Design a protein around this nucleic acid. Structure first.
Ligand SMILES: [Zn+2]
Ligand SMILES: [Zn+2]
Ligand SMILES: [Zn+2]
Length: 85
DNA sequence: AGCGTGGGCGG
DNA sequence: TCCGCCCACGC
């Protein structure tokens, strides 16, 4: 944790600089990635990608048990667990 | 469910 | 640094 957050009202520390730079955007309100379709801005590129799937209906992740598809891998992970009970 | 969004991290 | 995952938590 050699990269602490300078903003006085915040107590965060990071292992890498790349993360402090990304984290700083929370305080600056910096939203660099815009959606062509709805023009909404996002703080992260990876979140813009998944958001875009809400428009196209793209669902790359299918459940191994029932085949139900989802836009994100975490949605599928949360789902598969329901086949236990 | 649907999906916003930050942290850790490998490349 | 960026990229783009996993992972996690929120409403
Ligand atoms: Zn901060
Ligand atoms: Zn959009
Ligand atoms: Zn299933």
């Amino acid at each position: 944790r050699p990269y602490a957050c300078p903003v006085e009202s915040c107590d965060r520390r990071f292992s890498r600089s790349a993360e402090l730079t990304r984290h700083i955007r929370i305080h600056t309100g910096q939203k660099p990635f815009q959606c062509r379709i709805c023009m909404r801005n996002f703080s992260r590129s990876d979140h813009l990608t998944t958001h875009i799937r809400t428009h196209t209906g793209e669902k790359p992740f299918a459940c191994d048990i029932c085949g139900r598809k989802f836009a994100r891998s975490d949605e599928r992970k949360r789902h598969t667990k329901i086949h236990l009970r």
